[PDB]
């Protein structure tokens, strides 16, 4: 799609390979199918389905779509930078002292039985 | 689920209260409605409204096939032999009760209420046959027998003068938690050969048995 | 009114019979935290 | 006149009370004008005391401390502890989480047209530099950025018999050893069945004032 | 022509974003917060959401001292 | 056995609790004795047990001795003897400001009684004295007992605005045609678990709705009929001699 | 058993369809070197078996499609179904 | 290409639709897209306070005493056992009021939730057991990190995995 090239133009990336637009459009189709599918399930849920209790009539307001998307981003879609979590977590790590030692001009390795000894693997 | 309580007795064990039997009733109903959902969807995707046996046997598509074929035609193994050999016995009509459960499945005659109690609003333009009703009877019976086996297994894995009012004839084996653990166990996810996409993220899938 | 810990130990004593006794301070805390996160997300 | 030091902040910045006084008498915990008292509740005050045995202000003081004091009460704190077995004081400082909290409570007003990610970012480029006009930017020569004095080493050698040898530090934990730490009056409990065991002064002291 | 280049300034948005915030961190924070709040000076710094017209993304604040 | 539904003449609980007190050596828990004696019958079969534990020997535990005294002091309050209520309290209480205010209150001058309660709580609140869990249910409840004996009904209006319970329904109610709609729904939040007091609020607003024609007559006859039968059940739970 | 299975991989009697060179490349990609030949043939074999399993899934799901009791093509519906029945995710292609 | 691209885009009749999308959308009171305000507004407790234009039913006034009580519970991971009903109920009321609902949780929710929980954890530990031994052993933290590297679809990311990669301490310390 030419409009996908137009959207590429926003990020200064005019060097595509022409498989990307097919692929990303396929992707968005898949994604929105799933989205407005489970939103339709939730529109059914407000319409109180089981093995025969009532009908199924579709409106699909925006709230249902919002629900169907928040569930997806519950386990996907790299969220806002979780800075505070990382700050406190890293303060918990950044708490116990350095070793304050001298291996005296070499490399200090972990002890063997934590080192690997990359021999030819064998039974 | 009087038939299920009889079927639960047929497997091995006795004395479920109403709780476990209503729960098992819900279990079987859910399994079966899912089966018919999938089979109807597949047929209509092939482009036919009538529900058929070829889809449903392939819907199981597993060692689940040899036993089902025998049930239609009429209309490991050492353990099932050894346990039955241990059972061999008589009196107070010992072998007699065994038969009751075999010929009191929903497919025996009561096909109508078995069809109606489960979902039937689906496929309003068509209506399935009684052959599939008998089939479902087979599947429901096998499911009840399996669930009971796992419940007993987990139960076992857990491990003065008489006052004459305790009858010494009452036992309490089976309850909600046992069946729940068993039905977790049976949802062994897939053989795990169907969840090999090991390093990723996200998941969803339905399952039977 | 009514006349007034063995949940995890029962959750794990019934998994295996060859010991496999987990350690607190390293493993158990992980699991408790996972459970907490699960309940919070679900009820939300 | 650089003053971004640790011990000097306590030695010089002294003899004035913008502080928060603590109070201890071996059973309760208190600070400031507190109507109530805190017992040995490890859910809270041990989280506090963990920090205060170090020199970090916890992240959470800031917003109440800000709305309470309009001035002459911030930048850092010192805490006034006094036992009843003396009086003692010791200093606490920021951690970059306190500083990020100093940006949060600014977000409860003017959430729109505020260019948050821009303005509240560039704010730190000025603040962080301004807090710290004492950095130690001074090199020193290694054996690696000159020549004629590259040293010798004898750990990564080649024995004639054995293949090669290396340097690998030394624990005391062996194999098949103990893994880690452990997994962790009923007459009175029977004799206390069905036991189930100053706000109304607050709403009357206002009316007695009126 | 260039009118469309000048117009193409969409600035799309999502609907909802996640925020990675566990129970433990915010719980300790809020706990110590209301402790100090009741000690020095509900009265804490809280949001206000209406039972209706929710589903929005930012809400106002009480800011009661 | 649900309500262990005897609730009849010399029944099982009365005959079991009065058989315990005749044998020394067993010492049934005091808040169960208070519950069994009040709910079924045999009040005086319960004071035989809650005085046997208090006096005589000591039980060699402070937390069994204080839970006995609280179980005793709401038996005396239920049977409305105050002279044994106010004499068990000041035998027990530890401050001086509450041994003064309890004794200025069973005499009956309620102006020097309330002053010694607000001067009792300021002996607390960062005072060094520990003051107990009970003796703090005496300060905040007999400040509001004397402040409603003295008829200060505007001060404890704004007090009961904040907590919010039957005390708001009682003082703001009687001290109903124009403010009926806030009063009617606030009754029905507390009209469950009914008592002989709460039916008088339910009946009276059904009567002043009949005055404006909002409520029909017949309903006040049914509301007075089913309410009297609850007043009957509280009379039958009391001892035989009229006190 | 198991020990026969590495008695057998060594000689030419059982040499997986996947050539030794390609598996060596894919071992190396995901980071594994060893101067044994058994193990590489074995991972070859397991992969061969897994693809055979999706093969039979496709065969049967094609056999259901019409006339239970211009040649065969394993199309996107057959694949959509079998890959789905696994854990392989949804194939929702499109046009326009 | 850019000029020719815009000309070809004008070749389609959607040049008019392209010409109209010049404004700033989200014609609402707002949809902020920043970070810090998302965080803060997703950190403070909310309060479901209600209007009353003509009548807002429910017959049970909204409170935020419940939210404070919910955030104050001795939640899991301090204690050594999965929470019994009461704790979980106290925590939920808090979350429901904090999101903008009203009415009390009805004592069946807690139990189904416990059920799903213990099922979850049995799955996880079964995975780790499938790691360590093929067919007297004892399990560690590293095996659980291994299995949460293999199978991460089990746990939702955030909060704990980052915390998991900050507890892997070395032997001497």
PDB file of N, CA and C in Angstrom, chain F residues 2-3 15 24 39 66 80 90 95 100 103 109 113 135 142 156 160 169 205 212 238 241:
ATOM      1  N   UNK F   2     -29.436 -25.191  65.227  1.00  0.00           N
ATOM      2  CA  UNK F   2     -29.880 -23.866  64.713  1.00  0.00           C
ATOM      3  C   UNK F   2     -29.754 -22.844  65.841  1.00  0.00           C
ATOM      4  N   UNK F   3     -30.846 -22.593  66.561  1.00  0.00           N
ATOM      5  CA  UNK F   3     -30.794 -21.689  67.747  1.00  0.00           C
ATOM      6  C   UNK F   3     -30.728 -22.614  68.960  1.00  0.00           C
ATOM      7  N   UNK F  15     -30.556 -26.042  82.681  1.00  0.00           N
ATOM      8  CA  UNK F  15     -30.279 -27.151  83.584  1.00  0.00           C
ATOM      9  C   UNK F  15     -28.847 -27.646  83.467  1.00  0.00           C
ATOM     10  N   UNK F  24     -17.350 -27.806  91.971  1.00  0.00           N
ATOM     11  CA  UNK F  24     -16.136 -27.013  91.781  1.00  0.00           C
ATOM     12  C   UNK F  24     -15.023 -27.822  91.138  1.00  0.00           C
ATOM     13  N   UNK F  39     -28.785 -15.434  76.262  1.00  0.00           N
ATOM     14  CA  UNK F  39     -29.559 -15.754  75.070  1.00  0.00           C
ATOM     15  C   UNK F  39     -30.684 -16.735  75.361  1.00  0.00           C
ATOM     16  N   UNK F  66      -9.412 -10.352  83.557  1.00  0.00           N
ATOM     17  CA  UNK F  66     -10.025  -9.156  82.995  1.00  0.00           C
ATOM     18  C   UNK F  66     -11.149  -9.501  82.031  1.00  0.00           C
ATOM     19  N   UNK F  80     -29.803  -4.284  84.563  1.00  0.00           N
ATOM     20  CA  UNK F  80     -30.066  -2.902  84.955  1.00  0.00           C
ATOM     21  C   UNK F  80     -29.868  -2.625  86.436  1.00  0.00           C
ATOM     22  N   UNK F  90     -15.394   0.740  89.862  1.00  0.00           N
ATOM     23  CA  UNK F  90     -14.419   1.508  90.619  1.00  0.00           C
ATOM     24  C   UNK F  90     -13.604   0.644  91.567  1.00  0.00           C
ATOM     25  N   UNK F  95      -7.362   4.774  87.030  1.00  0.00           N
ATOM     26  CA  UNK F  95      -7.122   6.205  87.116  1.00  0.00           C
ATOM     27  C   UNK F  95      -7.789   6.772  88.364  1.00  0.00           C
ATOM     28  N   UNK F 100     -13.578   9.261  90.170  1.00  0.00           N
ATOM     29  CA  UNK F 100     -14.369  10.411  90.587  1.00  0.00           C
ATOM     30  C   UNK F 100     -15.621  10.556  89.732  1.00  0.00           C
ATOM     31  N   UNK F 103     -18.547   8.094  90.314  1.00  0.00           N
ATOM     32  CA  UNK F 103     -19.261   8.269  91.564  1.00  0.00           C
ATOM     33  C   UNK F 103     -20.043   9.570  91.609  1.00  0.00           C
ATOM     34  N   UNK F 109     -25.435  14.048  89.650  1.00  0.00           N
ATOM     35  CA  UNK F 109     -25.088  15.389  89.194  1.00  0.00           C
ATOM     36  C   UNK F 109     -24.173  15.259  87.979  1.00  0.00           C
ATOM     37  N   UNK F 113     -19.732  15.327  86.317  1.00  0.00           N
ATOM     38  CA  UNK F 113     -19.426  13.994  85.821  1.00  0.00           C
ATOM     39  C   UNK F 113     -18.758  14.068  84.456  1.00  0.00           C
ATOM     40  N   UNK F 135     -11.954   0.430  80.227  1.00  0.00           N
ATOM     41  CA  UNK F 135     -11.800   1.764  80.835  1.00  0.00           C
ATOM     42  C   UNK F 135     -11.571   2.797  79.736  1.00  0.00           C
ATOM     43  N   UNK F 142     -19.501   6.875  78.303  1.00  0.00           N
ATOM     44  CA  UNK F 142     -20.163   7.619  79.359  1.00  0.00           C
ATOM     45  C   UNK F 142     -19.832   9.094  79.322  1.00  0.00           C
ATOM     46  N   UNK F 156     -23.960  16.314  70.176  1.00  0.00           N
ATOM     47  CA  UNK F 156     -23.898  14.936  69.713  1.00  0.00           C
ATOM     48  C   UNK F 156     -24.750  14.686  68.476  1.00  0.00           C
ATOM     49  N   UNK F 160     -22.403  12.287  65.839  1.00  0.00           N
ATOM     50  CA  UNK F 160     -22.958  11.122  65.166  1.00  0.00           C
ATOM     51  C   UNK F 160     -23.108  11.317  63.669  1.00  0.00           C
ATOM     52  N   UNK F 169     -29.803   8.208  64.282  1.00  0.00           N
ATOM     53  CA  UNK F 169     -31.230   8.031  64.049  1.00  0.00           C
ATOM     54  C   UNK F 169     -32.033   8.424  65.281  1.00  0.00           C
ATOM     55  N   UNK F 205     -42.839   6.633  61.512  1.00  0.00           N
ATOM     56  CA  UNK F 205     -42.825   7.263  60.198  1.00  0.00           C
ATOM     57  C   UNK F 205     -43.871   6.651  59.277  1.00  0.00           C
ATOM     58  N   UNK F 212     -50.121  12.544  56.413  1.00  0.00           N
ATOM     59  CA  UNK F 212     -50.057  13.270  55.115  1.00  0.00           C
ATOM     60  C   UNK F 212     -50.738  12.418  54.037  1.00  0.00           C
ATOM     61  N   UNK F 238     -36.279 -12.275  79.939  1.00  0.00           N
ATOM     62  CA  UNK F 238     -35.853 -11.719  81.214  1.00  0.00           C
ATOM     63  C   UNK F 238     -36.243 -12.659  82.344  1.00  0.00           C
ATOM     64  N   UNK F 241     -39.066 -12.497  88.322  1.00  0.00           N
ATOM     65  CA  UNK F 241     -39.436 -11.410  89.218  1.00  0.00           C
ATOM     66  C   UNK F 241     -39.242 -10.064  88.537  1.00  0.00           C
TER      67      UNK F 241
END
